Ligand binder design. Structure first.
Ligand SMILES: [Zn+2]
Ligand SMILES: [Zn+2]
Ligand SMILES: [Zn+2]
Ligand SMILES: [Zn+2]
Ligand SMILES: [Zn+2]
Ligand SMILES: [Zn+2]
Ligand SMILES: [Zn+2]
Ligand SMILES: [Zn+2]
Lengths: 319, 329, 334, 336
């Protein structure tokens, strides 16, 4: 029994048979799936790329139960997980160039497949988890952690520089942990989440309600090298745009709004604006290595029965 | 010596005789032979910016002969063919300066803006040694146009053998085509004037497309499958959305300065992982562009004018019929 | 069932014999027209490398028409004009594999060494490690790119050189490809080949500077004209050309080495560490190969080869150890 | 102020003469700085022997690792104030015109003037644009070992093309070794120490070295190929043929070998294993001003702290002999 979406904007229905795996495929008993905004947003079905009934979740981890034909590397019982990436075309320039996250023919778990008691995934797109970190602990890495690490690595930032993380959400606190493990200096925007970040290794904290972030960073850091925007809102977007020094990189981690962007201030200051959706297998494995090295989350455990309500809570903003 | 100056903003420049000052330590006085015209010049004359400049001698695109050297000058001799770029001087202390990114120096002094024809003074370490075989009018438009284009191409993270679009073949457009072809790339032209399109095809453009006749985004997505880089010379909302759409997943938009806040759908960018970025290049950039011009791989097409008809030229710029260079000879 | 030449024993002639043409799941067998001749091929016959093959077919440079598809192959169609590179297959699991650096996979299978080569008219290869050739360039024309061309393109890409800089090529067949490739990449190039017949050919290919190491000194010349080069792609790796290449590079420049001689070469870190010289690789990845293929199909790269028959293969190897060979050779299947 | 007694090289392979010398007056764009503590490098000794083809012109006062107070400013000096805590690096001056200079690669300027070689190093004169602003909370003796050792280390690490979270070997734990460990751990890497001295190895393990290995007791290459599967980078401080072969072997396919020392040997290179494995071998002597300032930021961040012994100028000459004996831990000359 699993939760499935029959129709969009309609509550998920709770028994389906666990299908047999074909050649080069894997059936994995789910131990803990993670909740993403991608999940809710797929559930509403309001996206240009729309997902027949299917099962959400791209953040599932567990034990290997069934292997397909031709499986030689993954053994039955390995602690592994299934990321947003289900499968790529392996033929496009992105795929063949270690940029498979941009494959046009990518199949995404929970969208183009039945995402995360047993889930089927291709053996070459599953992540080997560390042998000493609980499955609930590795859960946010399948989407949040790896996207953060991909953005941070895409912020063209050398160790020992300054980076802003706008909005300390789940992605926020993972981003702080990772940047500190990457050997950078960090700054962010709830005063309690600020305090949590300061305890996490944030060298600077600033509430945008109390004071102005741009002037502060311009009088203390002289502009930051990178800005990782977890919570993309117009206010935090202008703030990010301003908080960066000349030539710095603003990384974006997906509301449907068209945001005004000054073509003057950027060209003058040479600010580069990147966007990062999810990391690759390599990124995923490194993020897992950083988690297993104990350098990196705080999540709340819930039951399948409470899945629908959680989505409602997500719409209310109480999370 | 008589020179044109801005007495007041939005007011025609007065041609008034001005004294040629004496160069101090580390300064050089240079006979101007030909200055080049940028939209930066007109826009500085109107002074319509939070960073406003009076009275100031315009032009950041002047070239000529070394006449007077300062005290302590050892490398540049009296009589060298040199030019003076948009960069007049930097602070040499900020991390941009010390990191070979001096074009981003907070305390940069800009020629024709923060400083002042016939004879101009410049700091000896911010002047570009031009090639000894290319005419002064020919190398003149590179000081801003050429080097900014070359810095944008270098800023597009594009390896040789890939595809790049040039939205609007202006002066900067044809300079960009020449430079990208000398860089060993594949190019496309979105200029809306079929005659400029034909000129680009004659320059080495593998693809040409008028945005009025057909849609560029679908065309490039059905032929090239999206381009790796997009260098926007003429930044307009129409050319901006088409530029955004012309890029393949993971590509870079290079922008070369309208006062509008442009809407951008951040969903399509983050989803496709598109990167959006070069006002002027550094000394290195300038020298490299000059080497490419002296190798005859980049030849510009300019219109020569007299100093007296400057205001008329600005009027033409505002009128939109317009690269132009003034010839002292 | 046809006739093919194979290695029975090392330093012993490849004998021809009819072999059964074996098409596994997710594998592809293609009738080959391109035979590949490389130095790497010959030394597998000598087997002098510590990593030696288990007998029995050489050649990692075969191209032709797709004949047989495996089970589950959906991208490659029967009749596609394709080729098979030095890379037969990787483990697809190591960090090199997972990071688009599959040329460094520990568990790589190489064609002509760990598997059967393109010496037979028909060879089997994994569908995800074959190169789709251009639709307008002859099989004989694209054939030497499968190893020479792509190693060159990977070396140039590994010389950390921005277009409009200077690069030296120390110019055989591999060298002669390298010149074309660098000019199409938009660089300024120089030739340290010591043969004026090859030197003039390089000047005809687009080499801006040429210098014979017997007549004059290259290091002093380049330090008095270019002031040292940014990169040096060494095709023919010999101690003399090694010292020369090292000296010809400017401060901070990159030394590219392509050959594989069995010598331990003296190199003083005084010269390198003082000048900050970086010394770097051969055989590119799938992306690299495809790039070289695009460069050839754009007509910017055109090899010069001599066509031979399969039967004379040992003769060719013999001539190769004799040193009278200069310029790549592709045996025909017409 | 006044004028003061200083140690100088009269002739090569001959002990330094301690004799009173003038404090020269700084011209336009020049600076006179009170010396508070200089650091001792192998570059100094090797310049004293003068055994390099690039030989200096005697007399010349060695030491490229001096820090202290700004005393006199030149004409046109506007950024550095009289009394700033600054230091003078191996780099005295560049030509500011060559492509290396113009491109923020001034460390390779053909016309570079080096302190302690082409110029001298109680008071030293230096160019105002090639001096390092020290952190405002670190003693002079503490920042002294960074001027050549630390910044060359940080430049080598930056020259090892290593992303954070990878593995790097440090061959030989000298002064530069322990500085390298400190920097790599502050850079967020995983480290290994092939120091053969088990006690300095233990110090490295105390510094944050995840792995330690004595090459006398065990084989390093086999160990790293069975534990890490080869390291991404190898920073060689103490360059000897044995540790050179070891470094070459310790790296995984495609890794980068960084070299710090400068022995006069011509070293064999088996380019077959390198070409096979695609190994890159880069040489790196010193960082630039940017590098230097960053290393100082890391020291002022309290993330880097060297261990040095303070000695007197009178026994500096003796120290040279101690180094030739190999009984030498970084050494700093105090002037309290
Ligand atoms: Zn998600
Ligand atoms: Zn794909
Ligand atoms: Zn301009
Ligand atoms: Zn500055
Ligand atoms: Zn070969
Ligand atoms: Zn592998
Ligand atoms: Zn030193
Ligand atoms: Zn210089």
């Amino acid at each position: 029994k699993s939760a499935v979406v029959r129709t969009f904007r309609e509550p998920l229905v709770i028994e389906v048979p666990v299908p047999r795996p074909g050649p080069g495929e894997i059936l994995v008993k789910v131990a803990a799936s993670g909740v993403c905004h991608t999940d809710l947003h797929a559930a509403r079905g309001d996206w240009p790329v729309k997902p027949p009934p299917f099962i959400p979740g791209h953040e599932g981890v567990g034990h290997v139960v069934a292997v397909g034909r031709g499986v030689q590397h993954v053994k039955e019982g390995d602690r592994v997980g299934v990321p947003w990436l289900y499968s790529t075309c392996g033929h496009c320039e992105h795929c063949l160039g270690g940029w498979e996250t941009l494959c046009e023919s990518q199949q995404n778990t929970g969208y183009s497949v039945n995402g995360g008691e047993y889930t089927l995934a291709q053996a070459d797109y599953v992540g080997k988890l560390p042998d000493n970190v609980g499955f609930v602990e590795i859960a946010p890495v399948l989407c949040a952690g790896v996207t953060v690490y991909k953005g941070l690595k895409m912020t063209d930032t050398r160790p020992g520089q300054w980076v802003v993380i706008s909005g300390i959400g789940g992605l926020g606190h993972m981003a702080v942990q990772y940047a500190r493990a990457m050997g950078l200096n960090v700054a962010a925007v709830d005063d309690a989440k600020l305090a949590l970040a300061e305890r996490l290794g944030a060298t600077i904290t600033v509430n945008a309600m109390q004071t102005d972030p741009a002037r502060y960073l311009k009088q203390t850091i002289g502009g930051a090298h990178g800005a990782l925007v977890t919570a993309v809102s117009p206010k935090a977007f202008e703030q990010a745009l301003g908080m960066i020094r000349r030539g710095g990189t603003v990384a974006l981690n997906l509301p449907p709004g068209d945001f005004p962007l000054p073509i003057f201030d950027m060209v003058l200051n040479g600010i580069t604006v990147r966007g990062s959706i999810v990391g690759t297998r390599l990124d995923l494995q490194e993020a897992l290595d950083f988690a297993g090295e104990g350098k990196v989350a705080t999540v709340k455990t819930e039951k399948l029965e409470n899945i629908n309500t959680v989505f409602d809570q997500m719409t209310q903003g109480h999370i």
